[PDB]
Symmetry: D2
Amino acid sequence: EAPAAVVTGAAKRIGRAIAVKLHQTGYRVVIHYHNSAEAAVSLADELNKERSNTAVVCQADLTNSNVLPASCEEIINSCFRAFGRCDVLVNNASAFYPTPLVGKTVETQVAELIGTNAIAPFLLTMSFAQRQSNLSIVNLCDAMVDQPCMAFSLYNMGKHALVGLTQSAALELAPYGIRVNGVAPGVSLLPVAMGEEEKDKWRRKVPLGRREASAEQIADAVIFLVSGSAQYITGSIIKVDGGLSLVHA
Amino acid sequence: EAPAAVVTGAAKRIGRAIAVKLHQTGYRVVIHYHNSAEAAVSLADELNKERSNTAVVCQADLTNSNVLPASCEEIINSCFRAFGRCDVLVNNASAFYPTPLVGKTVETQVAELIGTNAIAPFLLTMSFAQRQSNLSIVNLCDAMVDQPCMAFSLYNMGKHALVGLTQSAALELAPYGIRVNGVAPGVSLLPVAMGEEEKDKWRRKVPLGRREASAEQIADAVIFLVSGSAQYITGSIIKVDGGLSLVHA
Amino acid sequence: EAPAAVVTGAAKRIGRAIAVKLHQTGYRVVIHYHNSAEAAVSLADELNKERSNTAVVCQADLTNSNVLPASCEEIINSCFRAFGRCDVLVNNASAFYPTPLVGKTVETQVAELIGTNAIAPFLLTMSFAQRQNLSIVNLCDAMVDQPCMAFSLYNMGKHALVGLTQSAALELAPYGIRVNGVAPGVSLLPVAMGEEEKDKWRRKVPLGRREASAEQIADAVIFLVSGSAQYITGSIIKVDGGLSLVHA
Amino acid sequence: EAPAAVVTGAAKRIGRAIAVKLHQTGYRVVIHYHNSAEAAVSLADELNKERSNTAVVCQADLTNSNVLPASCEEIINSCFRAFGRCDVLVNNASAFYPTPLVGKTVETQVAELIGTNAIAPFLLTMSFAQRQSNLSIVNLCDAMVDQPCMAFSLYNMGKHALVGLTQSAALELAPYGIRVNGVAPGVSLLPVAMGEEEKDKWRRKVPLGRREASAEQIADAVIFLVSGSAQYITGSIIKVDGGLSLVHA
Ligand SMILES: NC(=O)c1ccc[n+]([C@@H]2O[C@H](COP(=O)([O-])OP(=O)(O)OC[C@H]3O[C@@H](n4cnc5c(N)ncnc54)[C@H](OP(=O)(O)O)[C@@H]3O)[C@@H](O)[C@H]2O)c1
Ligand SMILES: NC(=O)c1ccc[n+]([C@@H]2O[C@H](COP(=O)([O-])OP(=O)(O)OC[C@H]3O[C@@H](n4cnc5c(N)ncnc54)[C@H](OP(=O)(O)O)[C@@H]3O)[C@@H](O)[C@H]2O)c1
Ligand SMILES: NC(=O)c1ccc[n+]([C@@H]2O[C@H](COP(=O)([O-])OP(=O)(O)OC[C@H]3O[C@@H](n4cnc5c(N)ncnc54)[C@H](OP(=O)(O)O)[C@@H]3O)[C@@H](O)[C@H]2O)c1
Ligand SMILES: NC(=O)c1ccc[n+]([C@@H]2O[C@H](COP(=O)([O-])OP(=O)(O)OC[C@H]3O[C@@H](n4cnc5c(N)ncnc54)[C@H](OP(=O)(O)O)[C@@H]3O)[C@@H](O)[C@H]2O)c1
Ligand SMILES: N#Cc1c(-c2ccc3c(c2)OCO3)[nH]c2nc(N)[nH]c(=O)c12
Ligand SMILES: N#Cc1c(-c2ccc3c(c2)OCO3)[nH]c2nc(N)[nH]c(=O)c12
Ligand SMILES: N#Cc1c(-c2ccc3c(c2)OCO3)[nH]c2nc(N)[nH]c(=O)c12
Ligand SMILES: N#Cc1c(-c2ccc3c(c2)OCO3)[nH]c2nc(N)[nH]c(=O)c12
């Protein structure tokens, strides 16, 4: 029997590439999405086309609420329903927008940023662990957590909490054989709304090659961490940033 | 005229000492509390018996919710109402209990621990910044954030986000002359629930002195960080642990 | 054309496993050693038996001195001599003994611990860069921030290795050279250590209550020098089973 | 009886401020220097004109060689001979220049930067500890240890090693009551040879004020760390950088 993997926010960009590669490795995937219903579905269609019944979709909002614990348990549940097992969880879904200190209200901002980046990953880990070889969770972190974007404080707090969850969960879930690790991109696929002038300014800052990471480059770190080549690695966070975090002001 | 400072969860223990020492320095203090009402009024009495009209009390629940932004704004507004100014905010109040991955429900456990330790300090920082000449914020952190206690995931996640806030708030509030900094205790006042055998067990781990810190010793770093001796210090976290975090397993 | 790798202190233990792994991946290796002459050669025979003209030995002391720059240039040189090219450098050789503040003279201890753990790696990096998927892998320590008692000099050299890994990555990026690290917690324990002492250490490890096998440390090195890491540089990968996360 | 302190490379700039400040505090100081003879002697005169028998000088080259251990032993000795005690050690002397990986030969470059920044501090610490109440060492570090200058390999290797000495020594010397701590400037006094265009360029990168630190601001961190307000503090490194380390590329 093949193994299975939940990948959150897998309809587009880095998440898509993670799923495509995990699928290519022989994993049966659960494709989580929120708004991108069309891309999510046509991907699962594409993945099923060359291996029958190996992909399923699952929609949830991961924003913080009194219903998030239930939302998160269903996503883990979907994997056991579809495939009868859950071997890998990839926490990838993420809200990313400015929240300056000086349309959405602040309580919405808090819920969306802390919810997607930290709280949901925590509950998804709880469910993952409680529903239980090569079992392992992978969190998509940030290489620049200590040299952050201006006015992106709430986002930063969430990414900082993701590091704390990764280390905490790694410690607790080790006696059960569950490895928790992280993958921290510097600058990868730039936001779809980013203009070519502001995209290239960030490129010129990258020591290794003067470009952003492909999604496939980030996905390769995930594959390594879930492979049998990482049987002794837990609580680790792998930067994939082309040395960008080493560059001073 | 005397400067004014608000210290959260300051009825008892480490917060008490921080307010006491800030008062002795010459500050007018706001003593925020949650449950410990009787100790909060008793402290305000002693501080006003020393100097008339220099201390006020302010009850608030810092548990995460949609009304918290208003709660945190209120606390900042009590200070501006009592003393006509707010110079220093000390984020001290914190929930601390285990939340295992394998009475209170998880959505309560999330709201309390991420609320008190991270989100509340973020909202207080907004209101402080908003209401605005040696201006500084001091967040009470944790030295052991990278070697956390077992089954203490939500708390650790919170404390980690406080590092992210201290870092991001410092950078953004820098052109307004507001310094954001942190103080990280190893083991200080041990919890009231802990037995004498378990407290001793932790004391023997400490390299410097084989004992915990007094709250006076934690407060001392706070006074430093808000003094005119730290004018160029911002985004810094002063570990006050007696080398505890250096000890390997 | 088969690619070529230099691996320091590769006669036995972790270094031997990194050489064996790189050979099986299809690399031509340079087995460096200090005192273990018989083991380095006996390894080279076993690798040349599988593939003719693929392994060589190279002796050098990496203890700091005014001749060390030359010693290191020669190790690089022996690679270009035997194989015509130099693709990978694994900084693995390391002195490890207590040097308390309160047999060897202090200036020997300094020489051996700072030379092998930091200064030699720095020099091999210059020579590797000067002589030119090119990548350097520096073997570090997961416990650099939670050090062993009375082991100051060792920790100083391991801390300086992190510093080199970062600074080299930054400068050698425009040349397409990737500098990275693998940081073991507790792996193959000293020869040399008692059995009751080794069990006390094993019981500390969250994942398995065992130390890392040499081959498990080798796996992370194989990753960093592969095409799967094309974008990774200035990174240090903990391979420690959660050791660095355990409080006292 | 007044306490005594050793301060390396104390003739001009930062180390001069530490010395002057330690003097105003009440310490008897040993002004170490290497090449600034007139500057070191001139300072001793000004400090002695204030309080008689409080300031002496000690010339030494701290570049690494076989005769370095005895040199460092002699500096520690100077203090004990002039004052009959040694309470505080400030490791300040530092070589700072490029060492590209692609006049001075390489082995001379290794000797100076590693020697001044790390090996000397280790030997001075040994001798300080061997010779032995508020006993403390303070190492001058770098806030930018993780975002280094281009082609400053050896120097940055040195300041990294300095952080490891601060931690290993703090752990080992704790049973004795010797606290080892650090002070990490971002940009204080800029190099004398640096151009005013390049000086302003580094200044405008600083979040808090858009200017470098006064040497006296750095000194304030040293003073705090050797004081009774820092009794429980050991193994700590205080950044004093105006938030420079937090600014991304
Ligand atoms: N891109 C970079 O340069 C970069 C840099 C550093 C770190 N990273 C990290 O790597 C990961 C992937 O990066 P990315 O650029 O691919 O990110 P992204 O496109 O902005 O976000 C990934 C997905 O998360 C989902 N999502 C957003 N908000 C959600 C919500 N409130 N509830 C549930 N799902 C939500 C979205 O799916 P739907 O459209 O279907 O809603 C989206 O496709 C992220 O964790 C990110 O933080 C990326
Ligand atoms: N003590 C240590 O060994 C240690 C170690 C590391 C870090 N720290 C940090 O140092 C700071 C102070 O330590 P501590 O031991 O004095 O803390 P603590 O006594 O355990 O808690 C501090 C205060 O927080 C208030 N509080 C609790 N829940 C709250 C809520 N839901 N909403 C608003 N306020 C709430 C309480 O006030 P009421 O009683 O009035 O409800 C309490 O007095 C904390 O940030 C702590 O995490 C302490
Ligand atoms: N083993 C662990 O638990 C552990 C933990 C953390 C990090 N590491 C790191 O991983 C790497 C390998 O560990 P290991 O246990 O395999 O190492 P090791 O046995 O302690 O040393 C490896 C080799 O280094 C060479 N060497 C020693 N002193 C030298 C000198 N003065 N000049 C030149 N070469 C010298 C020796 O070669 P010869 O025998 O030929 O003389 C030795 O075989 C090391 O860099 C270490 O720092 C290991
Ligand atoms: N300036 C900055 O922006 C900055 C930034 C970060 C950290 N720091 C750290 O802060 C400390 C002081 O800074 P600084 O700018 O005042 O340093 P500095 O002016 O560059 O040099 C400090 C002193 O060290 C002595 N010295 C140089 N080479 C020596 C050698 N080979 N042997 C013995 N002594 C030697 C010199 O004394 P003589 O002139 O008498 O020969 C010099 O005055 C240093 O440890 C530095 O690493 C400075
Ligand atoms: N650009 C960018 C992003 C970053 C990012 C990239 C480069 C940075 C950064 C954040 O901090 C400073 O350097 N993080 C993101 N997370 C999500 N979910 N989506 C994104 O687009 C990004
Ligand atoms: N003991 C303890 C506490 C700790 C603590 C003590 C020792 C530790 C620790 C947290 O992480 C591992 O080592 N954090 C606390 N926070 C609050 N609010 N109250 C507490 O009592 C503690
Ligand atoms: N054991 C061990 C070693 C360690 C080591 C092992 C366990 C540790 C450690 C270092 O820090 C605290 O936990 N570092 C070494 N370096 C070399 N060169 N050779 C070794 O054997 C070790
Ligand atoms: N400028 C500068 C210096 C720095 C320095 C300044 C700015 C930096 C830095 C080091 O890291 C990147 O940003 N370190 C120094 N050490 C000595 N001994 N003397 C100096 O002048 C400096």
